[PDB]
Design an enzyme around this catalytic site. Structure first.
Site, short mmCIF file in Angstrom:
data_model
loop_
_atom_site.label_atom_id
_atom_site.label_comp_id
_atom_site.label_asym_id
_atom_site.label_seq_id
_atom_site.Cartn_x
_atom_site.Cartn_y
_atom_site.Cartn_z
N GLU A 34 -13.42 -0.53 5.63
CA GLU A 34 -13.92 -0.39 4.28
C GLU A 34 -15.32 -0.97 4.20
O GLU A 34 -15.58 -2.03 4.76
CB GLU A 34 -13.02 -1.12 3.29
CG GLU A 34 -11.58 -0.76 3.37
CD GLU A 34 -10.70 -1.80 2.71
OE1 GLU A 34 -9.65 -1.43 2.14
OE2 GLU A 34 -11.04 -3.01 2.77
N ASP B 130 0.79 -1.23 0.00
CA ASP B 130 0.00 0.00 0.00
C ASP B 130 0.83 1.28 0.00
O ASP B 130 0.45 2.23 0.67
CB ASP B 130 -0.93 -0.03 1.20
CG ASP B 130 -1.91 -1.17 1.13
OD1 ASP B 130 -2.05 -1.77 0.04
OD2 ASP B 130 -2.54 -1.46 2.17
#
Ligand SMILES: Cc1ccc([C@H](NC2=NS(=O)(=O)N=C2Nc2ccc(C)c(C(=O)N(C)C)c2O)C(C)(C)C)o1
Ligand code: NA
Length: 744
Positions: free
Chosen positions: A521, A246
């Site tokens: 999320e 990431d």
């Protein structure tokens, strides 16, 4: 070299391949009769095909008498059984072809009141076709002296006839080639469609065994799939060049498909910030964009891509430990802040990129706020006058004095041309990121636009935050940002965790510290009753769904948990859909116990707004992680998801299309039956050798014997095909063996 045991060999051969055939084909009739009420279009076609198999079988006796003695039946019946055979072969070819167009439209019945009209009208039309084209057979067959002892035999007439070519070739091109060609069209696209619904298409191909791919890209992650008003499929991803993590050099990219996912164009790049050429560790030496949410506004048709941005570093792990103010309001305007090496005060970026001092005096420095280079690689470049010096997003080995706060930002780009070209990024952070928020980023996937209610037209993007009490250890909290003015202005809704009771006490997203009460999320859906449902990745092992009665701004205090659906702590995606007048939600995520065995869950929306889960079906075996669903229309859906096969780098993003039949029916009931395939291949492989040897029969004496034993065995296989055909219906068939045994 001759014999006459071949004279008695055929009496037994025509006997058994007539009893098996008349017994098997009789079972096909009797079973069709007392079952007539539930008869398909193909069930009537397979009947007439058994009638054709019976009529041809009812001539094999007369060939046994003639081989055991002689033809005692006249020139009339001699001329007639050859024509009767062409009736079998020609009707069978056209009956098989009528199956084809049936299955073609059925895979490319809704009113039974004309499924009988055109079905039986083509049974009559085929027999008329079969009978008319076979009547020319009466003139090329009669009784023969043969000069073979006292024997009268019936046979086709020999070589000396050539006025036949203008007649017989025509029979075969209409009674056979037209079926064969049209059947070849139907079952070719039928196979193309079944391929489309059962195989994945690699959209973003990652490298292999740790190497880069054809384009120098090691890894792709984080799919988003969008269906536009024009019917376009947009597939977005993170282009992770150096590695899968990431951070690093990541580009926001999309691929458009203009044919519902069969083919995909070249990569379009929304944004790709330029790396820091002087950074000490390249794997972390580039400003970062990561995780996008796609959504199209249905009135204006503007397509939004919204995504996280961090300055140079390990992404979220490059934020500063103590907070750094990122924005400063001066005279009612909000400007981004710059920090200058060596000093403490807050420079600001005002109009045109002009850098002002902490006390408000303009400097000769300027920021590229309106980038113009491809992928906008030049955004953030810092000029002194007209000399390039550096970039405000660089945090190490800098070649200019100024950097932005090492914080967490939220950017947005839009397209007004179906995703072919994208705007420069716009910083929406200051409209949504409150002061206490340590992190604020999107839940990647596809946001929505409210279809109904007092807030319809509102755009919802899922996000989640952390605070500075517990950060990623106990404050990850879901919410939505929204815009009621078509994307111009954004607002942050409340958190699901704001004022929620956990262990008898209220919590809030801003102050909480509680690992098991997090939610990160998420994917959002609006019901027809107007409520908004939020499906949130969390750490309870099963699905957590929060509900908002006011269009995303606030959420009810109770998080419903559904143990029916396991959540192995990974992103998921959900979409609203209607079917046959009823409301459903499709949800997709890893079925577990790791990020593996991708599943599609089906739920019906009950009157209260609660979910009845109907079905859970594997969509992808093996590695399976992030995914993104869309409805494609006409009972079809697509899904873009992360997967790895055979030493692919994490991850390759693939595309599968499915339909309601896969979605709702049990694991076994696929479709790719296709007993029809077996019947067609035998009706060709057996009959074609015969009718071809009898066409090359036309165009010393013992070279024609090779042509004559060709005539024998290829006529023998064309006879045994009328027995093999009922065995096809029972073994590989589904309805027949079931229905026959259950009427005994
Ligand atoms: C009424 C009744 C009882 C028994 C039978 C036999 N029919 C079948 N036996 S079978 O081999 O099991 N398959 C058969 N039909 C069949 C094939 C293929 C398809 C796609 C269908 C179709 O069109 N459907 C919309 C699903 C279909 O119906 C007959 C006709 C051979 C006697 O018909
Ligand atoms: Na048959």
């Amino acid at each position: 070299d001759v014999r006459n045991f071949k004279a008695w060999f055929l009496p037994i051969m025509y006997s058994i391949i007539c009893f098996v055939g008349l017994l098997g084909n009789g079972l096909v009739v009797l079973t069709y009769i007392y079952f007539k009420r539930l008869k398909t279009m193909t069930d009537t076609y397979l009947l007439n095909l058994a009638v054709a198999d019976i009529l041809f079988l009812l001539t094999l006796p007369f060939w046994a008498y003639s081989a055991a003695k002689s033809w005692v039946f006249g020139v009339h019946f001699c001329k007639l059984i050859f024509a009767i055979y062409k009736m079998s072969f020609f009707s069978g070819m056209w009956l098989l072809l009528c199956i084809s167009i049936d299955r073609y439209v059925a895979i490319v019945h809704r009113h039974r009141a004309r499924v009988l009209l055109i079905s039986k009208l083509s049974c009559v039309g085929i027999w008329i076709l079969a009978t008319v084209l076979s009547i020319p057979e009466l003139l090329y067959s009669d009784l023969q002296r043969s000069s073979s002892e006292q024997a009268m035999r019936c046979s086709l007439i020999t070589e000396h006839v050539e006025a036949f070519i203008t007649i017989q070739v025509a029979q075969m091109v209409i009674g056979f080639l037209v079926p064969l060609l049209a059947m070849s069209f139907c079952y070719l696209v039928i196979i193309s469609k079944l391929h489309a619904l059962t195989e994945k298409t690699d959209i973003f191909e990652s490298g292999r065994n740790g190497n880069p791919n054809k384009d120098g890209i090691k890894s792709y992650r984080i799919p988003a799939l969008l269906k536009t008003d024009k019917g376009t499929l947009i597939a977005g991803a993170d282009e992770r060049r150096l590695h899968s993590s990431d951070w690093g050099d990541i580009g926001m990219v999309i691929r458009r498909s203009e044919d519902n996912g069969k083919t995909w164009g070249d990569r379009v790049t929304i944004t790709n910030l330029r790396d820091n050429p002087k950074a000490s560790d390249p794997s972390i030496g580039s400003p970062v964009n990561i995780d996008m949410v796609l959504v199209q506004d249905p009135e204006t048709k503007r397509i939004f891509s919204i995504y996280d941005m961090f300055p140079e570093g390990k992404g979220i792990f490059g934020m500063s430990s103590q907070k750094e103010e990122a924005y400063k309001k001066i005279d009612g305007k909000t400007y981004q802040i710059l920090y200058r090496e060596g000093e403490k005060g807050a420079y600001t970026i005002r109009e045109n990129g002009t850098v002002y001092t902490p006390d408000g005096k303009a400097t000769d420095y300027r920021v590229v706020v309106d980038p113009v280079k491809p992928a906008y690689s030049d955004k953030g470049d810092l000029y002194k006058g007209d000399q390039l010096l550096g970039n405000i997003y660089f945090t190490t080995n800098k070649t200019s004095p100024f950097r932005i706060a090492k914080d967490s930002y939220l950017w947005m780009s839009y397209s007004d041309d179906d995703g072919k070209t994208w705007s420069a990024p716009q910083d929406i952070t200051p409209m949504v990121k409150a002061d206490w928020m340590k992190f604020l980023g999107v839940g990647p996937g596809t946001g929505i636009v409210l279809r109904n209610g007092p807030h319809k037209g509102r755009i919802l993007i899922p996000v989640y935050t952390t605070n500075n009490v517990s950060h990623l250890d106990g404050s990850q909290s879901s919410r939505v940002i929204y815009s009621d003015d078509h994307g111009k202005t954004w607002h942050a809704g409340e958190a699901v965790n704001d004022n929620r009771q956990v262990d008898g006490q209220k919590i809030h997203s801003s102050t909480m510290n509680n690992r098991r009460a997090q939610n990160t999320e998420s994917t959002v859906v609006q019901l027809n009753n107007g409520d908004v449902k939020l499906f949130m990745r969390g750490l309870t092992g099963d699905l957590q769904v929060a509900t908002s009665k006011d269009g995303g701004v606030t959420w009810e205090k109770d998080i419903k948990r559904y143990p029916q659906v396991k959540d192995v702590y990974v992103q998921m995606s959900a979409i609203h859909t209607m079917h046959e007048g009823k409301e459903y939600i499709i949800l997709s995520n890893a079925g577990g116990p790791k990020r593996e065995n991708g599943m599609v869950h089906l739920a019906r929306v009950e009157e209260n707004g609660e979910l009845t889960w109907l079905k859970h079906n594997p969509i992808q075996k093996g590695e399976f992680a992030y995914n993104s669903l869309q409805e494609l229309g006409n009972g079809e859906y697509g899904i873009l998801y992360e997967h790895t096969e055979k030493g692919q780098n994490a991850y390759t993003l693939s595309f599968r299309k499915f339909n309601w039949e896969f979605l709702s029916k049990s694991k076994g009931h696929e479709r790719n039956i296709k007993v029809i395939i077996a019947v067609v291949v035998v009706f060709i492989v057996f009959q074609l050798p015969y009718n071809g040897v009898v066409l090359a029969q036309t165009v010393t004496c013992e070279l024609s014997k090779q042509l004559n034993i060709a005539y024998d065995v290829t006529y023998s296989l064309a006879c045994v095909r009328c027995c093999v055909n009922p065995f096809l219906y029972a073994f590989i068939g589904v309805k027949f063996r079931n229905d026959l045994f259950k009427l005994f």
